[PDB]
Write a protein that binds this ligand. Structure first.
Ligand SMILES: [Zn+2]
Lengths: 60, 155, 117, 127, 98, 78, 24
RNA sequence: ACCCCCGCCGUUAGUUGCCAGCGGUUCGGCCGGGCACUCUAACGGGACUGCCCGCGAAAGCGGGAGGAAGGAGGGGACGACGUCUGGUCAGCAUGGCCCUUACGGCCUGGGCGACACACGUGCUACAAUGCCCACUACAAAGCGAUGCCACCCGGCAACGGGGAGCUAAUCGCAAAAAGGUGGGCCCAGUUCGGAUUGGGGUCUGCAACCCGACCCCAUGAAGCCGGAAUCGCUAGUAAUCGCGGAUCAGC
RNA sequence: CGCUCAAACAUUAAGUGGUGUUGUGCCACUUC
């Protein structure tokens, strides 16, 4: 229930209730930023990677 | 503080009496930052002064804190394991921390309902001495007297 | 004066006096004073003879309270007990009935702590 | 004719319009003592006026905004000081020393992460 | 009589095109207000630094958005054309109304 | 808690509305512990599921505004 | 108190307004 | 140290603000009007033990003036060679290993929320520096187009209907709360404390029994400041008061 | 209030014992 799990969040054959956000890259269901479509873990990487437009290290 | 002596913190003078002792004790009645309460309480106390005694409020306030002002406290010194209570002098900037505080206690021990009248009537008995705040001074002073035995560790 | 048949609120705010009445609180106390137009300030020791009668005839006749109310509460529970439902099994054992905590807390309907371990 | 300075304090900034006259002190409308009803911290604002004896000779229409109530009075201090030092540069020799022309950068420091209140670590444990 | 909104993620490139706009416009017809530096939105998304049970020492970034405004009273037939063959942004956003 | 259209599942009403046609028995396998007891399903004995099995429980007149799940515990120890 | 479900000092904590808090 | 925020000033800008300046005013920054200031957000300036004196071999230290800011101005970003054979193969990657009408796939439902009990972390308090209620006032940084919902109506209310504007420094979440003023309560297990429970009720969502959030009546508990021990903070800190956001149909 | 006990708990990385304090009848030694 890892592989097949990802292909379940693209179908939505039943109620909209059973719909949830899924990490595009990895496949996590927890900590998925509705802005990126990524999970807290990797979007951090792709944030070290500068492959994320605009996204920059912040300090104040 | 192990590095520097840590210079004492200077607070701003009163806004009605212009004195660095008044506000020094105000923030002492102050709880959680509500500087207003303790201030109002304080003055409503000095209004009790001018009603009970024809004296001037700040006068009975200067003489009150002075009375509950510890001359010689008792502290603890370590001399090779053994742990005594070596008495000695009370730093001139401690007498002021304590005294202003030691009125706070007994005024919060009073049966009186309103807070103004607990610091008012208490400061009217501190300048007298018979107050139950000075009875927190007379006590610690006794602990030093009776301990004047182990005085040869006065450092 | 005995208002709830046997309950006697006296010597205090007439509005708050009705609070100690089983079935009356802080919302029904502001209602009976406005339907009989009575002073919510004056104490109970001093009011019209027709006012003790006024609130006694009204209040004790407006709805259910006192002991006949507690009476029904027990029954309502005794109905959750008889057939034996879930919102019944929670009275029947004494645990909380809102699916709350039981692994910790819940001492309100679990009594004092028992330890043993 | 006019005097002006610019004093700030914790987001709460304040302008200062000085004009020769009575002792009138209107701040964004609002009578002076009125806009600080029941606030002992008030009377501290008009401090740079008794250090110059020109309290009963100068009105002043203030325009403060931002921050809380008590912090504002601090943005009126820096302002009244800069206003009576502009049209009067000589009052500065005996003004700055007593302490009246300083920003005072004491600001609520950012809350840290791993804390509730920046300098507030979760009640430690070990059991 | 004409307004334009410049949104972007890099104020360096955004400010260069904001200034680029004034040169052509002004110096060919209409009175034109300089670059108006509008308030700055910032999307700060904080995240747990570690990949597991390490709720602390985390790391957070921000997605700054720079917004600048410029107006141009008269849309000169000489400027309308002066603002189509000289405009070469990149990762910038622009909008035009009336 | 719902108020308009007291919720339920149609299947169960399906297999029971035929029981009101010629009043036969009162037996049926169910899975909708969610649904609401019908004031018209009085006297039947439904078997409600709880993750473990089916519990045959009789319905009366007092219990109506409740659900089947109430009369079908899920915690082995009641 | 702040833990009250029927006071001004309560509704200012539970987010809700209800009867005991100004509204349209 | 080179970077960012906050402190002082100036340049560039005037759909943010301003009877400051005058004119009209439904006397509301609402119209004209203006860039001053406030602000907004970019560019730079500034502070280098530089100046004075004292101490000193130098480095450096102590004192004073100027100054918005001194001796690192407050705050962040930044964590070495390695250690913990620390953590995670369940985020992903990945050698080895086992399963393969199955250790894989589906679904409804249950469960992860079970309670004789124990620890960590928490919130609310046990009240007169307070509880309650009315009126009245002041933030920052943020977030919002089947989302934020102005205002009108019903309703005790949660809410619903009607409907304006808003992809937003233009509309909206928006009352900030404690504060201020007036009022009540008058030391009581209380108008403290709101745990628990009965009844009625609203909304999201196929569906709230197991298990949701919230409203009203009612019921109103342990609780009168906490043993051993133990916890945080050197200043706008602790404490104390609020507000929003990520996650989300809701919680 | 003092005195004896079997536990819950607290002191230590851990163990042990001790002890602290409630409950009950009236720092030492050690970690194969
Ligand atoms: Zn990922």
């Amino acid at each position: 229930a890892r592989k097949a799990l990802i292909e379940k969040a693209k179908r939505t054959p039943k109620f909209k209730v059973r719909a949830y956000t899924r990490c595009v890259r990895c496949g996590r269901a927890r900590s998925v930023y509705r802005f990126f479509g990524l999970c807290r873990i990797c979007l951090r990487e792709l944030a070290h990677k500068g492959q994320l437009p605009g996204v920059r290290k912040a300090s104040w | 503080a192990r590095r520097r002596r840590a210079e004492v913190r200077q607070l701003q003078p009163d806004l009605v009496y212009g004195d660095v002792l008044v506000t020094a004790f105000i923030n002492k009645i102050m709880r959680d930052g509500k500087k207003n309460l303790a201030a109002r309480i304080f003055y409503d106390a000095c209004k009790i002064i001018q009603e009970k005694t024809g004296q001037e409020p700040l006068k009975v306030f200067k003489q009150a804190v002075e009375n509950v002002k510890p001359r010689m406290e008792v502290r603890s010194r370590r001399v090779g394991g053994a742990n005594y209570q070596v008495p000695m002098e009370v730093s001139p900037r401690r007498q002021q921390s304590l005294a202003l505080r030691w009125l706070v206690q007994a005024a919060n021990q009073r049966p009186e309902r309103r807070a103004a009248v607990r610091i008012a009537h208490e400061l009217m008995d501190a300048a007298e001495g018979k107050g139950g705040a000075v009875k927190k001074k007379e006590d610690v002073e006794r602990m030093a007297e009776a301990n004047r035995a182990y005085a040869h560790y006065r450092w | 004066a005995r208002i709830a048949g046997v309950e006697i609120p006296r010597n205090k705010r007439v509005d708050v006096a009705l609070t100690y009445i089983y079935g009356i609180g802080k919302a029904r106390a502001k209602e009976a004073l406005e339907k009989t137009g009575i002073n919510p300030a004056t104490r109970v020791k001093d009011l019209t003879e027709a006012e003790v009668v006024r609130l006694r005839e009204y209040v004790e006749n407006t709805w259910k309270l006192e002991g006949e109310l507690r009476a029904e509460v027990a029954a309502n529970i005794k109905r959750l007990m008889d057939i034996g439902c879930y919102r019944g099994l929670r009275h029947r054992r004494g645990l909380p009935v809102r699916g709350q905590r039981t692994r910790t807390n819940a001492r309100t309907r679990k009594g004092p702590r028992k330890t043993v371990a | 004719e006019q005097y002006y300075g610019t004093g700030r304090r914790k987001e709460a900034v304040a302008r200062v319009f000085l004009r020769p006259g009575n002792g009138k002190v209107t701040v964004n409308g609002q009578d002076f003592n009125e806009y600080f009803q029941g606030l002992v911290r008030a009377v501290a604002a008009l401090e740079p006026l008794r250090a110059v004896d020109a309290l009963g000779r100068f009105d002043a229409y203030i325009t403060v905004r931002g921050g809380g109530k008590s912090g504002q009075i601090d943005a009126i201090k820096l302002g009244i000081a800069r206003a009576l030092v502009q049209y009067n540069p000589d009052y500065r020799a005996k003004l700055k020393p007593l302490g009246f022309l300083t920003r005072d950068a004491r600001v609520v420091e950012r809350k840290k992460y791993g804390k509730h209140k920046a300098r507030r670590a979760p009640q430690y444990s070990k059991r | 009589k004409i307004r334009i909104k410049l949104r972007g993620f890099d104020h360096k490139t955004l400010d260069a095109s904001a200034q680029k706009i004034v040169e052509a416009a002004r110096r060919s017809g209409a009175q034109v207000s300089g670059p108006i530096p509008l308030p700055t939105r910032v999307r700060r998304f904080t995240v747990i630094r570690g990949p597991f049970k390490h709720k602390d020492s985390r790391e957070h970034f921000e997605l700054r958005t720079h917004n600048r405004l410029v107006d141009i009273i008269n849309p000169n037939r000489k400027t309308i054309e002066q603002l189509m063959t000289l405009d070469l942004p990149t990762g910038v956003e622009i909008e035009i109304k009336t | 808690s719902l108020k308009k259209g007291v919720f339920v599942d149609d299947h169960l009403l399906e297999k029971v509305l035929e029981l009101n046609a010629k009043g036969e028995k009162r037996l049926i396998k169910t899975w909708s512990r969610r649904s609401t007891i019908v004031p018209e399903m009085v006297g039947h004995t439904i078997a409600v599921y709880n993750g473990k099995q089916h519990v045959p429980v009789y319905i009366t007149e007092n219990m109506v505004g409740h659900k089947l799940g109430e009369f079908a515990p899920t915690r082995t120890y009641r | 108190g702040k833990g009250d479900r029927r006071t001004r000092r309560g509704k200012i904590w539970r987010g809700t307004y209800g009867k005991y808090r100004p509204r349209k």
